[PDB]
Structure formats: C-alpha cells, structure tokens
Amino acid sequence: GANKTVVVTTILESPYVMMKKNHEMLEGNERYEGYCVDLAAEIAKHCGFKYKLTIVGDGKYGARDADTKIWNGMVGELVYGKADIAIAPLTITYVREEVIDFSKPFMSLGISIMIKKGTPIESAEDLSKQTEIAYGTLDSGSTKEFFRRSKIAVFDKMWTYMRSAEPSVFVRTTAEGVARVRKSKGKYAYLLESTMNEYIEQRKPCDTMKVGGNLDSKGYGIATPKGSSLGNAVNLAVLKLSEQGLLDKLKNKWWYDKGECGSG
Amino acid sequence: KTVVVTTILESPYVMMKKNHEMLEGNERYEGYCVDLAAEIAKHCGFKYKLTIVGDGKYGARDADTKIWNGMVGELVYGKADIAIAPLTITYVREEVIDFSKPFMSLGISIMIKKGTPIESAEDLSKQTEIAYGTLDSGSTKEFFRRSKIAVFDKMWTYMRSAEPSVFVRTTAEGVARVRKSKGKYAYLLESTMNEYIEQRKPCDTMKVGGNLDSKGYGIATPKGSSLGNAVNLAVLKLSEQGLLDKLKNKWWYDKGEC
Ligand SMILES: O=S1(=O)NCN(C2CC2)c2cc(CCc3ccc4c(c3)N(C3CC3)CNS4(=O)=O)ccc21
Ligand SMILES: N[C@@H](CCC(=O)O)C(=O)O
Ligand SMILES: N[C@@H](CCC(=O)O)C(=O)O
Ligand SMILES: [Cl-]
Ligand SMILES: [Cl-]
Ligand SMILES: [Cl-]
Ligand SMILES: [Cl-]
Ligand SMILES: [Cl-]
Ligand SMILES: [Cl-]
Ligand SMILES: [Cl-]
C-alpha cells in the first residue's frame, strides 16, 4: 500500500512530447517538453502521485497482431503491465476500450488530409476518384484501422488502394509522412489526425495545409489498465482541467502561441 | 426486464410525433435521441420504455437541500435506469453518475438576432444595452457560476442579479426572447441547439463567434450500473460505423428551412 512512482508511457510526437534542446545533460522527466508533458504534471498534481515519463520502446501507439494477437505500442505497455498509465495523443477506439480504460477525452481530433500547398485536392472523395496523387497513413495507429474497417464507399475504396499500393504508402512516424508530402512535389497526400495536421501547418517552411473537413470525430483519452484504481481520479482531473480552461490554454501554448507561420 | 429511459423534450432530440395523442409508449416520440435509444438497445439487447423527466429539467443540485433534480436526480434516486438525452458531461455530474464516452460534441455558444452588434462573449461582457442569459438547472448556467475566467466571471456577476430575470425555463423560451427583443437579448445555449434553430423559420437567428468551451453529451447511468459497460461500447461502435454522423445530418440539416 506504499506510494509507488507511476510509470507513464508516452510517445515522441510533436508537440505532445519533445526532446528539449539541452536534453543531453538533463535526466528523468526534465529531458522532455510538450503538451502531454504539461498535462502529465497537471494530472499528477490533482491526483497527488509521483511519475516517471517513459517513451514507448517500439515507438508505436498500439495495434494487435493478426497472427500472434498480442498488443504493441503504448496499448501493449498497459495491457502487459509494463506501464501504469498512458498520457499521449492516444485515440479512443472501440477495440481499445475493450482491453484498456479511457478517461473522458482531453483533446478533440478527426482524420484529415495533409497536402503540399497547391495540390488539386479538397476532399477524401477527390483522392478516391484519382490516381496521380498517392496517399497513405501511419502504421499501427487508429487512422489505418479506420480505413481497414470502414464500410463507407469512399473510405473502403481508399483502403483497397492503399493496402496494395507500391511502393508502400504507409509511414512509421508522422515526421516521415510530413517529409513525404514535402518532397513529393504534390504527388503525395498524408492522412493524419487534425491535431497533428494543424500543428505542422504552423511550422516552417509553412508548405503544408489541412484541406477539407474531417472524416470522423473522436478524441484522445488518458489510458490505464482495466480496473486500475488510478482511472477514477485521473478521469475527474481531465474534466476539472477542461472546465477551468487549462486544456484550451495548453493547446494554444503548443500549437499557435509559438507558430512560425505568421500571426494569423 | 424493461429498462426505464429518462429523457427530455428538446428538439430535435425528443419530439412528440404528429397525432401523438392516438399513440402509446415509445411510438409517441421521434428525434435524434429516440433513434439513438433504439440503436443502443439493439446493440445491448434490452427492452426499454421512454419516459419524459417529470420536472422537465436536465439536472442541478440544490445548494441547501443538496437534492438533485432533472434527469440526474432520476438516476441518482433510482427513478430511471439510464438517461439518453442531450445531457452534458460535467465534473460535478461525473462524481455522482456514470457517463459513457460522448456521442455528440457541443460548446456553449451565443444566439443573437441577425444584425445584433455582437461577435463574442467579450463583447457581451463589455456592454449593457443587450441583455443575455442561460437556461436554468443546466450545465451552461453552472459553467458561468463556477468560472474563474475574467470574461465569464464578469458575465455571471451581471446575469445572477439582472432584473427582470435573464434566465429561462426552456430553450424555446430563450429562442422566443431573442426573436421578439429586437436584438436587445442574446441567448447563451449549446452550439448543437443553436445550429438547429439557425436552420428553422423564420431564419432570424444566427450563431456568432466561436464556442466558449468544448464538451459532449454522454449516455448516463447510475454509478456502478452494469449497463454502463455495454452502452459505452455501443456508443463507440455507432461512432466508428458513422451512424452518429448520419443521425446528426438526419435531424439537423436534412430538413432545412433556411
Ligand atoms: O471518441 S469519442 O469518445 N467517441 C465519439 N465522439 C463523437 C461525438 C460522437 C468524440 C468526440 C470528442 C470531441 C467532443 C468532446 C466530448 C466530450 C468532451 C470533450 C470534447 N472535452 C474536451 C477536451 C476536449 C472534455 N471532456 S468531455 O466533456 O468528456 C472526443 C471524444 C470522442
Ligand atoms: N492517435 C493515433 C495515432 C495517429 C494516427 O493514427 O493518425 C492512435 O492512437 O493510434
Ligand atoms: N445539455 C445541457 C442543457 C442545458 C444547458 O444549456 O446548460 C445540460 O445537460 O445541462
Ligand atoms: Cl518507487
Ligand atoms: Cl415536441
Ligand atoms: Cl400533433
Ligand atoms: Cl412502446
Ligand atoms: Cl423496446
Ligand atoms: Cl465540468
Ligand atoms: Cl482569464
């Protein structure tokens, strides 16, 4: 019954968790900065526990293997007892809800389209009705699962192309997808979550943009293992910080307050 | 055995059908939350009976009595097994009842008569010609009372003591007040209901500015209820299948008079 340090699994994803400039001479949680770094501190204060930030070893959000049927990423860390809690841009999904707990959402997002400025694309329907511009998603994430399991005509049509496109249209990190859009002269569009799309749109060289409306509506939740006694208090902490307006303050802090692409 | 569902008459969520007087049971009602209750019950495999909350209130706790009214009280005191309604997820409610993951997004918004010289909550707080208020016994009123944000705290100080009362008992009452006040009244309501009214005749109201907060509606059950697990998974399933977006388009825009 003695108080133990809470093991927090997170992921290096800008601006949620980022290496500080002088990280090579810093230790522990001091190495990291970002939205989820500030959020982890706010949560820990309200719940009154100590915690250690740990980057997920495999750098994945969470997917279940078809053959082995074992969870990887931050989800696996919680399922197999490697971490006590996940504080990261982890999307709430049906399949994950069955195996882990999710607090009420702390941030909203929907799948969106990233294009290099000037690309003749305005919607997912435009992508599905053409072949000149390739497009893909992140691996081991909820966006890829959205298209694989979608029974909607446009989305089902897009998945049928992406799953067998050559060379692979999928990426293993968001930065990989951003670079692919930037160095493809408009011949590649990246399907990612609106939160990350809006952030990149505010970073140099300011050559990308979110186009069209979102394909779905969901949020990020603070995840814990099923039955964890921490879930109750953290859930109330999220709602408290939301009502106080802190969650709105943190987004502006890490998305627009230091936007490198103008004042607007 | 039959699940008692408490809901509230709020368009387009729950509405009396035409010729409802010769109908009985769940067939008397139509709307977004009526379809949602059917979708949820089908996925969880239970029978249910729709009942309008007796006091016609969403849910607030009396300061002295500490007694919950509205649909929240129905769940706390065992009068209903589940609430399927535009019930806002809030911190104070989370302490006393369970909430599924949200099934619809909303934020506090401003309703004005078209042409009113107002663009933000900050504009309202910095003037006195145009009155403004909220619904009683709801989450919007509680948001302003408990807010330490400068603009919202300033707005609450005015509304709590304005005469005549700027608060209303129903959404329809607030809509009417905006329409026949020649722009000297703005109504603070949730964006979902603001967007619906904006698409209804006489098309003389509009939603202005961004929302003041960001939250959602959740399917509510008593704390510890065994139903909470199945309904929560049902909501997420309907979300990923896209049926929640379908129902939204069905009851908000598919019949637009503006
Ligand atoms: O994956 S979901 O759970 N399932 C389905 N949907 C869709 C609507 C059908 C959504 C939608 C959202 C965004 C709207 C929303 C709802 C509730 C709350 C929000 C923001 N906040 C704000 C900080 C962001 C705080 N607490 S809160 O009051 O709970 C998030 C998660 C999901
Ligand atoms: N937030 C996603 C990862 C990013 C994406 O899939 O676009 C997840 O939890 O899997
Ligand atoms: N959805 C709101 C309605 C009343 C309000 O606008 O605050 C509630 O549950 O209280
Ligand atoms: Cl320890
Ligand atoms: Cl009605
Ligand atoms: Cl009638
Ligand atoms: Cl019936
Ligand atoms: Cl039934
Ligand atoms: Cl709240
Ligand atoms: Cl302030």
Swiss-Prot record, chain B:
Residues in compartment: Extracellular: 117-258
Tissue specificity statement from the Swiss-Prot or TrEMBL entry: Detected in forebrain. Detected in dendrites of neuronal cells. Expressed in the pyramidal cell layers of CA1 and CA3 and in the granule cell layer of the dentate gyrus.
Site (Interaction with the cone snail toxin Con-ikot-ikot): residue numbering on this chain: R61, R145, K237
Subcellular location as annotated: Cell membrane; Postsynaptic cell membrane; Postsynaptic density membrane
Residues bearing PTM Phosphoserine: S147, S181
Binding site for L-glutamate: P86, T88, R93, S139, T140, E190
Induction text: Down-regulated in the pyramidal cell layer of CA1 in the hippocampus by global ischemia.
PTM description: Palmitoylated. Depalmitoylated upon L-glutamate stimulation.
Cysteine pairs bridged by disulfides in the record: C203-C258
Residue(s) at site: Crucial to convey clamshell closure to channel opening: I118
Protein family (similarity comment): Belongs to the glutamate-gated ion channel (TC 1.A.10.1) family. GRIA2 subfamily.
Domain observations: The M4 transmembrane segment mediates tetramerization and is required for cell surface expression.
Extra information: The postsynaptic actions of L-glutamate are mediated by a variety of receptors that are named according to their selective agonists. This receptor binds AMPA (quisqualate) > L-glutamate > kainate.
Role summary: Ionotropic glutamate receptor that functions as a ligand-gated cation channel, gated by L-glutamate and glutamatergic agonists such as alpha-amino-3-hydroxy-5-methyl-4-isoxazolepropionic acid (AMPA), quisqualic acid, and kainic acid. L-glutamate acts as an excitatory neurotransmitter at many synapses in the central nervous system and plays an important role in fast excitatory synaptic transmission.
Subunit description: Homotetramer or heterotetramer of pore-forming glutamate receptor subunits. Tetramers may be formed by the dimerization of dimers. May interact with MPP4. Forms a ternary complex with GRIP1 and CSPG4. Interacts with ATAD1 in an ATP-dependent manner. ATAD1-catalyzed ATP hydrolysis disrupts binding to ATAD1 and to GRIP1 and leads to AMPAR complex disassembly. Interacts with GRIP2. Interacts with GRIP1. Interacts with NSF via its C-terminus. Interacts with CACNG2, PICK1 and GRIP2. Interacts with GRIA1 and SYNDIG1. Part of a complex containing GRIA2, NSF and NAPA and/or NAPB.
Name this protein carries in UniProt: Glutamate receptor 2
Organism this protein belongs to: Rattus norvegicus
Organismal lineage: Eukaryota, Metazoa, Chordata, Craniata, Vertebrata
Gene name of this polypeptide: Gria2
Portion of the parent chain present: 414 to 794 of 883
